[PDB]
Amino acid sequence: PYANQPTVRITELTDENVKFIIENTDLAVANSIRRVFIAEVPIIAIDWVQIDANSSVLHDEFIAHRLGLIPLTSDDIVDKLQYSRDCTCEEFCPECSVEFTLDVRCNEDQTRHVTSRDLISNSPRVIPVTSRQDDILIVKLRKGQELRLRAYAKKGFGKEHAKWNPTAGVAFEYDPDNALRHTVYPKPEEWPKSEYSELDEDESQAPYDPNGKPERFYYNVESCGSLRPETIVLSALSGLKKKLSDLQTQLSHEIQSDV
Amino acid sequence: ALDVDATLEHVQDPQNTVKVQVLYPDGQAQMIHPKPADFRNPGPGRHRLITQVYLSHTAWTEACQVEVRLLLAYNEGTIPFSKPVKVYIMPKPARR
Amino acid sequence: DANSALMELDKGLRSGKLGEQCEAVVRFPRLFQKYPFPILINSAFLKLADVFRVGNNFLRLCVLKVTQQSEKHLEKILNVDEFVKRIFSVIHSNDPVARAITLRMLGSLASIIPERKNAHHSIRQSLDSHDNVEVEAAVFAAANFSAQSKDFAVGICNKISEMIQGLATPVDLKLKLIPILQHMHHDAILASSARQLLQQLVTSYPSTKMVIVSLHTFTLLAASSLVDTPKQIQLLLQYLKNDPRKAVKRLAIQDLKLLANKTPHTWSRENIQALCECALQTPYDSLKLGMLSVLSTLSGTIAIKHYFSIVSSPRSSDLVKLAQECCYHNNRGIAAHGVRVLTNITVSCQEKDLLALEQDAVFGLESLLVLCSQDDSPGAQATLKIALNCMVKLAKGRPHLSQSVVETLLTQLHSAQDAARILMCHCLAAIAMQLPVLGDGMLGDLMELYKVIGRSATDKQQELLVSLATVIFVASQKALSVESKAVIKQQLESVSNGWTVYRIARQASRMGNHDMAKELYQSLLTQVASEHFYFWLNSLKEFSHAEQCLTGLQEENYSSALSCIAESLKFYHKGIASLTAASTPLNPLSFQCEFVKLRIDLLQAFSQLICTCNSLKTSPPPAIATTIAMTLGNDLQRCGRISNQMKQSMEEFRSLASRYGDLYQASFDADSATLRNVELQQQSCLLISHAIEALILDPESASFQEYGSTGTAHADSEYERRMMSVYNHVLEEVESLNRKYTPVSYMHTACLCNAIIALLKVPLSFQRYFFQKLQSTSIKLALSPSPRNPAEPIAVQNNQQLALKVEGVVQHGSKPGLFRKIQSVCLNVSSTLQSKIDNMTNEMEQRVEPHNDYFSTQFLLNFAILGTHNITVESSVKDANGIVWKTGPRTTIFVKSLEDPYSQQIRLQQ
Ligand SMILES: [Zn+2]
């Protein structure tokens, strides 16, 4: 009658991504664990761009767009920062934001590549992922014109905009051999063996399971460079716990009002 | 500015002797002479000291403890004669 | 989990049945001592107060118990008025038991509400009613406040005086009422009023019950209010003399004992005189025992000097007569407590006429010994222990009578029936620890006692066996004869536990008779199961054998000295290998290993020095003369190649001396014996250094006279005495030989060699802390900076600051303060630049005092360099007297340093 004992284990880890397996857990909880990675993993990304003077061939709004999508290293300072719309202060304060500056004046004959390395930050903890490999391109500049802007970056999360989404790609699956027979193959010969399959060469089709439920879910989360994958997963779980706690508190108050 | 309020009992020449000492966390001790006007005299040999002590320092990551104590000088050297108290201080760095 | 655990009990408190409600209520002290957080404590007590206010009159009893159990946690309540209102709201309930419970609870809350006038009033009201079960609780609460408040006690004392002197209230309650008058110590006027009340109360109720209660209560009062003790003592003495009630006399004794134990000096002369007269008059043995116990307690303290203070012969003094008569009185207990006073007076006060009393005492001692020899009763052994303690005190205080007492004790060794023998042997060993002639000549008789052990007892052969081993080793100064093999066989044929043989081996090694140690440990080696003990035993065997080999030294023969030293070092090295192997994460033998390793270092220094001085004749003069003209030698005054080696070895010896300093200031745990031993070794090292420096190097520069008190017989062990003798010999030689010859070291080599031989002559003594460790203390010191899971360095913007929050807790395994009690912790923090004054700009210290067991300290570190940094924190505990006592884990943390690119560009442009 109680939630089963979830059991997990990692296959291998790397800066690029993390691959792991979950055992003794339900499909719905696994799916929610996935969804939280895509949606509810807050990070720091540029969100307020003020342009003193723009003269390149990319119109200003395009530059604001591109600066929006650059990734920033937010290993732990994300916890310290507190949402902008929620922080009570004058406009932006060092607690609820971070400041970036970008001034470039191409004066040489050759075209200059205005690139992310030129974005001067205020706090060393956060910088474009490329800094700390080729640079992320912003806009090319001909001799003569200039680009001067000041940006403020804040803490958001997936729902608000996809520039806050750090999970480059999540591969979620289970029953690599359709044992549960959720899916049906009219010609199971044609389909390719899943890399996680354990079937023989001839069979290539697990037997039907009269009694069973999805188990041993497989996860492969690839970071976009904003956060280490392990930190991503931990933050996902912690934020989901926070949400559940909020729901419990509100509904307890509702029950007390009811009675 | 930290308001400092104290009661001094049975002291001769309080105004020329008593001095407020502030020990910062980092091991530096600053001596502060209160003004001759800071010493009220409600009753016989029982003075009150009211003053401001000015604290300052660069930015700290977290709150710290600044110790405030009352010293007695002589004519050369000093004697603590009071219980040190702790005050929480937090200098944040400049804003925009 | 701290918040969750509370609501889990909350729902229980909300359960319907008093079963679950009681289970919840009595479950809190667990949660408190699990989570001492003040927020949780306050939240808990609010619900406890509410369930007390609305309860089933048994939940109230449970809550009363909870309050009486978790009293230390009460002070840390932020919200007091609400809680006290809840508790006090059930004092108006008409139920005479619900009033009694609440009065008890208030009494249990004097600590946090000691000035509440409404509580004071309610208690003073309930104190005069008709319901026994509430009056007997109001009495308790009144006694509780009368200690933590004054303006309540002033009113109470008057109330109680009236309410005693009114014929109301039964005698049973009048008994409970009087003790409140203990806590009238707040003011002198309170004490005077209470005493005036007593003088009438005792005469107005001359019962036995009331007298027994009142006299004790007000002797406690006199102890507390230290202004009328002279008055209290004379009243007690009058009641001792006059009242015939045996019980009242016995209370008088058991009360005068407390007063003589707390404040002995105030006792005047006539007080002691009258007490002695009363002790003489009584015909009753038990009362005489009581008075003599009181007198024995007084004698040890300063009171005796005042009593024998002049401005009547001491023989005219009655105290002497009582002492003498009781020294021979029939009863064993009376005789023991008599000899006590005699010994104390003889040791402390030294008058011309008292010398005959020395003979009187010493002769009474053997009478006591023979009387207690064979009784074999618990009281008999108690008296015997007291007698032997008196013997030890007499001997050590006065060396004159040591020879007298020792021979007697030896003669009783024959007649002791194997029960008192252990005690007597302990006494003898303690005595012999001072003077050697007390052990040197009595070799055979002790072994005659030893040989008959196997047959004269079977129940506790082991303890007397080990004791006899200790005494025989102490007596044997140089080595062991056939007596040795006789001991070996005695053990073999007689029942001999492995543990026992180990203890005899330990004592042998401790007293220096290393010859027996190697033999015994060899027998041990083929024993034990775990490898750790085998390695430890083997290491100890090798050490003992090396010491034995060293002992075979010949006076003034440099040839054999080098070979013997080399051989003994060839063995210590195996020993160190084995010992280092014996270590484990548990009990890593730090002191044992380090002390012995530095011992090998010492002996190597000695070998190098002896080789150098011998090489003095190794064509040394040839070098200096050939290099430069001998006259006005540039290399040195009569320069020689050996000058460089003499500088080298002098430096090495000083360094070794300081390494003993490191060991000593690192132990902090051993008793006062091992510390003196280590200091002694450091003294030897520094002695050789001073000798070589003041005799070979510039002697005129030193030109220091050994003008200090020397040779005072204050040493605590024969080993120390012998070392002090050797030091004095070396100094008296070197002072004479300072200027006689030129630095060319004609005979100076002879003096150095003789000093080395002397220093090696006294074999060694592995001290207690080496074997068996007591008073285990440690500092956990888990600093809590920005935590760093791996060794990955931590970041700081470089422009602002860093704060550490070094947290430390001190943990005691054994008796917390057996010898030294921690008084302060001198945390010293330093930083260094990892990649490279090496950047010690941030090097500071704070002396935090641990208030209960826990001390936190905020440390601020400033630094503005790119590279990583190492942060070192050193504990340096400090004890009562004030000493460095360097200890502490000495943990390190790595910290990274980075700068904002904003400032980076600013600096670049500038
Ligand atoms: Zn803000």
Q: What letters, b where the CB count within 10 A reaches 16 and e where it falls short, cover C553-588? A: beeeebeebeebbeebbebbebbbebbeebbeeeee
Q: Which chains are adjacent to chain B, needing at least 3 Cβ pairs under 8 Å?
A: A, C
DSSP assignments along C760-825, one per residue: HHS-----GGGSS--S-EEE-----SS--SSSPPB---SSS-EE--EEEEEEESS-TTSS--EEEE
Q: How far apart are CA C197 and CA C849, in angstroms?
A: 46
Question: CA of B33 to nearest chain A CA: how many angstroms apart?
Answer: 37
Q: How far apart are CA A222 and CA A167, in angstroms?
A: 6
- Rg of chain A's alpha carbons, rounded to an integer? 24
A224 annotated to bind ligand: no
Q: How far is CA A27 from CA A174, A241, C134, C683, in A?
A: 9, 18, 66, 77
- Domain boundaries of chain A, sorted by first residue: 1-42+163-259, 43-162
- Rg of chain C's alpha carbons, rounded to an integer? 37
Q: How far is CA C300 from CA C265, C275, C392, C716, in A?
A: 11, 16, 14, 22
Token representation of residue C892:
């390190």
Chain centroid to CA A145: 35
Q: How far apart are CA C507 and CA C512, in angstroms?
A: 9
- Phi, psi dihedrals of residue A222, rounded to the nearest 5°: -105, 120
A106 annotated to bind ligand: no
3-state secondary structure of A239: helix
Partner B, chain C 759-788, Cβ-Cβ below 8 Å: 786
**C-alpha count within 13 angstroms, C-beta hemisphere, residue C663:** 28
Cα-Cα-Cα-Cα dihedral sign, residues C496, C499, C501, C507: negative
Q: How far apart are CA C683 and CA C689, in angstroms?
A: 10
Q: Tell me whether A151 touches chain C (CB under 8 Å).
A: no
Report CA dihedral (A90, A94, A95, A96) to the nearest 10 degrees: 60
Do A93 and B95 count as a contact with CB atoms less than 8 A apart? yes
Q: How far apart are CA C880 and CA C875, in angstroms?
A: 16
Q: How far is CA A174 from CA A33, A215, C154, in A?
A: 14, 7, 83
C142 closest CA partner among C104, C89, C193: C104
- Rg of chain B's alpha carbons, rounded to an integer? 15
DSSP assignments along C305-362, one per residue: HHHT-----TTTSHHHHHHHHHHH-S-HHHHHHHHHHHHHHHHH---STTHHHHHHHH
Q: State in Å: Cα B94 to ligand 1 middle.
A: 13
Running DSSP on this structure, what letter comes out for residue A134?
P
Q: State in Å: Cα B95 to ligand 1 middle.
A: 10
Q: How far apart are CA A10 and CA C370, in angstroms?
A: 82
- Phi, psi dihedrals of residue C884, rounded to the nearest 5°: -70, -45
Q: Tell me whether C802 touches chain B (CB under 8 Å).
A: yes
Question: What angle (nearest 5°) sits at the alpha carbon of residue C574, between those of residues C573 and C577?
Answer: 90
Q: Which of C783, C801, C846, C863 would best serve as a mutation to test chain B binding (most B beta carbons within 10 A)?
A: C801
Residue C123 near residue C138 (C-beta atoms within 8 A) = yes
Helices marked H in C497-557: 498-511, 514-525, 531-551
Q: Give the number of beta-carbon pairs within 8 Å between A and B.
A: 8
Q: How far apart are CA C525 and CA C531, in angstroms?
A: 11
Report CA dihedral (C364, C370, C376, C382) to the nearest 10 degrees: 20
Reported structure resolution in angstroms:
4.2
Do B26 and C803 count as a contact with CB atoms less than 8 A apart? no
Question: CA of B66 to nearest chain C CA: how many angstroms apart?
Answer: 10
Query: What is the topology classification, in CATH, of domain A43-162?
Result: RNA Polymerase Alpha Subunit; Chain A, domain 2 (2.170.120)
Q: How far apart are CA C422 and CA C428, in angstroms?
A: 10
A95 annotated to bind ligand: yes
Residue C540 near residue C522 (C-beta atoms within 8 A) = no
A93 annotated to bind ligand: yes
C506 closest CA partner among C491, C516, C497, C493: C516
Q: How far apart are CA B86 and CA B25, in angstroms?
A: 10
Question: CA of B95 to nearest chain A CA: how many angstroms apart?
Answer: 6
Token representation of residue C843:
């090097």
Q: Residue A91: closest CA among chain B residues belongs to which residue?
A: B96
Q: Which chains are adjacent to chain A, needing at least 3 Cβ pairs under 8 Å?
A: B, C
Q: Tell me whether C901 touches chain A (CB under 8 Å).
A: yes
SS3 content of chain B, % helix, strand, coil (to 5): 5, 50, 45
Partner A, chain C 190-249, Cβ-Cβ below 8 Å: none
Q: How far apart are CA B80 and CA B20, in angstroms?
A: 10
Q: Residue C900: closest CA among chain A residues belongs to which residue?
A: A124
- Scanning the structure block, which residue is given the tokens 């970036």? A100
Partner B, chain A 58-97, Cβ-Cβ below 8 Å: 92-94
Q: How far apart are CA C132 and CA C173, in angstroms?
A: 9
Chain centroid to CA C93: 54
Residue C323 near residue C345 (C-beta atoms within 8 A) = yes
- Scanning the structure block, which residue is given the tokens 């020879």? C403
Residue C177 near residue C169 (C-beta atoms within 8 A) = yes
Helices marked H in C165-284: 171-177, 188-204, 209-224, 229-241, 246-262, 269-281
Q: Which residues of B fall within a CB distance of 8 Å from C803?
A: 25, 60-62, 64
Q: How far is CA A105 from CA A61, A144, A146, C399, in A?
A: 19, 7, 4, 100
Q: How far apart are CA C600 and CA C574, in angstroms?
A: 11
In chain B, DSSP finds a helix count (H) and a strand count (E) of 1, 8
Residue C222 near residue C263 (C-beta atoms within 8 A) = no
Q: Would you tell me how many other CB atoms lie within 10 Å of the CB of residue C104?
A: 23
A225: left (phi over 0), alpha (psi -120 to 50) or beta: left
Identity (one letter) of the amino acid at C310?
I
Q: Which of C4, C792, C897, C900 would best serve as a mutation to test chain A binding (most A beta carbons within 10 A)?
A: C900
Token representation of residue C177:
């009422």
Token representation of residue A38:
């895509």
Q: How far apart are CA C291 and CA C280, in angstroms?
A: 9
Question: CA of B35 to nearest chain C CA: how many angstroms apart?
Answer: 31
**C-alpha count within 13 angstroms, C-beta hemisphere, residue A190:** 4
- Phi, psi dihedrals of residue C673, rounded to the nearest 5°: -95, -55
- Quick check: do A1-42+163-259 and A43-162 share a fold? no
Q: State in Å: Cα A85 to ligand 1 middle.
A: 9
Exp. method: cryo-EM
Residue B65 near residue B12 (C-beta atoms within 8 A) = no
A1-42+163-259 maps to which CATH number?
3.30.1360.10
Running DSSP on this structure, what letter comes out for residue B25?
T
Q: How far apart are CA C1 and CA C37, in angstroms?
A: 12
Q: Tell me whether A192 touches chain C (CB under 8 Å).
A: no
Q: Tell me whether C898 touches chain A (CB under 8 Å).
A: yes
Question: CA of B62 to nearest chain A CA: how many angstroms apart?
Answer: 12
Do B26 and C844 count as a contact with CB atoms less than 8 A apart? yes
**Which residues have a Cβ under 8 Å from the Cβ of C237 and sit 6 or more positions away?**
C252, C256, C271, C274, C275, C278
